[PDB]
C-alpha cells in the first residue's frame, strides 16, 4: 500500500527511450564503428565540414555567395539541435509524477531553466575525448576542429566536453541518466515559480526515486548520489556561462540569428 519506486524508475527510463532520438547505447554503437549502414561522416576540418553540410543539411549551403560564414552555419546547427532536444524534453516531462498536474506557467518555468542543464547532461552521451556525434548520429565532429573556429565560436563546446569527460567517468547508463534528467527538471528554486510547495514535493519524490535507483544500480560507488547532486549544481553554472556567451554572440555577430524558441528560453533567465 505504498509507492512502487522501482516501477516509477522503469516508467521514467521507458519514457526517456521513447522520447529522445539519441540514447547512450545508440551513441556507443555508432561511436564504436559498428554502424555498417550510414556510418557517421567525420568532420575534422573545413573541407569535411563543407562536404558534410552538402549531404546532410544541403539547404543551409544552397545559397552560393550568400551562404553564411562556416562558424555561423555551425552555430545555427547547434541551435537546431537544442530546439529538437527542447521538444523531446517537453514530452519527456509528462512522465514525471506531478509535472502534468502543475499549472501550465510553472511547467513552462521549470522547462525554461531546466532544458539547457538537461541538454548538457545528455550531450555527454554523444561525446568522447576526441569529438561528438551530431546530426541524428550521422556526423562526428572533432573536438579539435571546434577549438579551431574563430572566436567566439571556438568557446562554445569546449566547456561542455570538459563537463562530459568527468560525467562520463561516472559510468552512468540510460536508466540512471533518465532519472537525473527528471530530477534536473524538478527544481523548486527556479526563479518565478508560483506553486513552490508542490514543486518541492515533486522534486523530493523524483530525487528519492533517483537515490534508490543509484543505490541498487551502482553498489560499487556509495557516493554516486551526492556526486550527481554536485553535477546538477555544476550544470547550473555551465548554463549561466553558456547564456553569457550566447549573449555576446547575439550582440557582436549580426549573422548568428537566434531561433525564437531559444531566445524565449534565454530571456530573463540569468
Ligand atoms: C552537417 C551538419 C552538422 C555539422 C556540424 C555543425 C554543428 C554541430 C551540431 C550540433 C552540436 C550539438 C549540440 C549543440 C551544443 C550547444 C548549443 C549551442 C546553441 C544553443 O545555445 O542552443
Swiss-Prot record:
Top-rank lineage group of the source organism: Eukaryota
Consequence of substituting residue 224 to R: No effect on heterodimerization with RXRA nor on DNA binding and transactivation activity
Effect ascribed to mutating residue 233 to T: No effect on heterodimerization with RXRA nor on DNA binding
Post-translation changes: Ubiquitinated by E3 ubiquitin-protein ligase HUWE1; leading to proteasomal degradation. Phosphorylated.
Protein's cellular compartments: Nucleus
Included stretch of the parent chain: 200 to 468 of 468
Record-annotated site: Essential for heterodimerization with RXRA: 235
UniProt-recorded name of the protein: Peroxisome proliferator-activated receptor alpha
Any GO CC annotation of this UniProt entry: nucleus
Positions annotated to bind indeglitazar: 82, 116, 266
Family, per entry: Belongs to the nuclear hormone receptor family. NR1 subfamily.
UniProt note on tissues of expression: Skeletal muscle, liver, heart and kidney. Expressed in monocytes.
The protein's assembly and partners: Heterodimer; with RXRA. This heterodimerization is required for DNA binding and transactivation activity. Interacts with NCOA3 coactivator. Interacts with CITED2; the interaction stimulates its transcriptional activity. Also interacts with PPARBP in vitro. Interacts with AKAP13, LPIN1, PRDM16 and coactivator NCOA6. Interacts with ASXL1 and ASXL2. Interacts with PER2. Interacts with SIRT1; the interaction seems to be modulated by NAD(+) levels. Interacts with CRY1 and CRY2.
Its biological purpose: Ligand-activated transcription factor. Key regulator of lipid metabolism. Activated by the endogenous ligand 1-palmitoyl-2-oleoyl-sn-glycerol-3-phosphocholine (16:0/18:1-GPC). Activated by oleylethanolamide, a naturally occurring lipid that regulates satiety. Receptor for peroxisome proliferators such as hypolipidemic drugs and fatty acids. Regulates the peroxisomal beta-oxidation pathway of fatty acids. Functions as a transcription activator for the ACOX1 and P450 genes. Transactivation activity requires heterodimerization with RXRA and is antagonized by NR2C2.
Gene Ontology process terms (BP): behavioral response to nicotine; cell differentiation; cellular response to fructose stimulus; cellular response to starvation; circadian regulation of gene expression; enamel mineralization; epidermis development; fatty acid metabolic process
UniProt GO molecular function: DNA binding; DNA-binding transcription activator activity; DNA-binding transcription activator activity, RNA polymerase II-specific; DNA-binding transcription factor activity; DNA-binding transcription factor activity, RNA polymerase II-specific; DNA-binding transcription repressor activity, RNA polymerase II-specific; lipid binding; MDM2/MDM4 family protein binding
Boundaries of every NR LBD domain copy: 41-268
Keywords: Activator, Biological rhythms, DNA-binding, Lipid-binding, Metal-binding, Nucleus, Receptor, Transcription, Transcription regulation, Ubl conjugation, Zinc, Zinc-finger
Induction summary: Down-regulated by aging.
Reported effect, residue 193 to R: Abolishes heterodimerization with RXRA. No DNA binding
Required for heterodimerization with RXRA: annotated segments: 106-235
Amino acid at each position: 500500500m505504498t509507492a512502487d519506486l522501482k516501477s516509477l524508475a522503469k516508467r521514467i527510463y521507458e519514457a526517456y527511450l521513447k522520447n529522445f532520438n539519441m540514447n547512450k547505447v545508440k551513441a556507443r554503437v555508432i561511436l564504436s564503428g559498428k554502424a555498417s549502414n550510414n556510418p557517421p561522416f567525420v568532420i575534422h576540418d573545413m573541407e569535411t565540414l563543407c562536404m558534410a553540410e552538402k549531404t546532410l543539411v544541403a539547404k543551409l549551403v544552397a545559397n552560393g555567395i550568400q551562404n553564411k560564414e562556416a562558424e555561423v552555419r555551425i552555430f545555427h546547427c547547434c541551435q537546431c539541435t537544442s530546439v529538437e532536444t527542447v521538444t523531446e524534453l517537453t514530452e519527456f516531462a509528462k512522465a514525471i509524477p506531478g509535472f502534468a498536474n502543475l499549472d501550465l506557467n510553472d511547467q513552462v518555468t521549470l522547462l525554461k531553466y531546466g532544458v539547457y542543464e538537461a541538454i548538457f547532461a545528455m550531450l555527454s552521451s554523444v561525446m568522447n575525448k576526441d569529438g561528438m556525434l551530431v546530426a541524428y548520429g550521422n556526423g562526428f565532429i572533432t573536438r579539435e576542429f571546434l577549438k579551431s573556429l574563430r572566436k567566439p565560436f571556438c568557446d562554445i563546446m569546449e566547456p561542455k566536453f570538459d563537463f562530459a569527460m568527468k560525467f562520463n567517468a561516472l559510468e552512468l547508463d540510460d536508466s540512471d541518466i533518465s532519472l537525473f534528467v527528471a530530477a534536473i527538471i524538478c527544481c523548486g528554486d527556479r526563479p518565478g515559480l508560483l506553486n513552490v510547495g508542490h514543486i518541492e514535493k515533486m522534486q523530493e519524490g523524483i530525487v528519492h526515486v533517483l537515490r534508490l535507483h543509484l543505490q541498487s544500480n551502482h553498489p560499487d560507488d556509495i557516493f554516486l548520489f551526492p556526486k550527481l547532486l554536485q553535477k546538477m549544481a555544476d550544470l547550473r553554472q555551465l548554463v549561466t556561462e553558456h547564456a553569457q556567451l550566447v549573449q555576446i554572440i547575439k550582440k557582436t555577430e549580426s549573422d548568428a540569428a537566434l531561433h525564437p524558441l531559444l531566445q524565449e528560453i534565454y530571456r530573463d533567465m540569468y
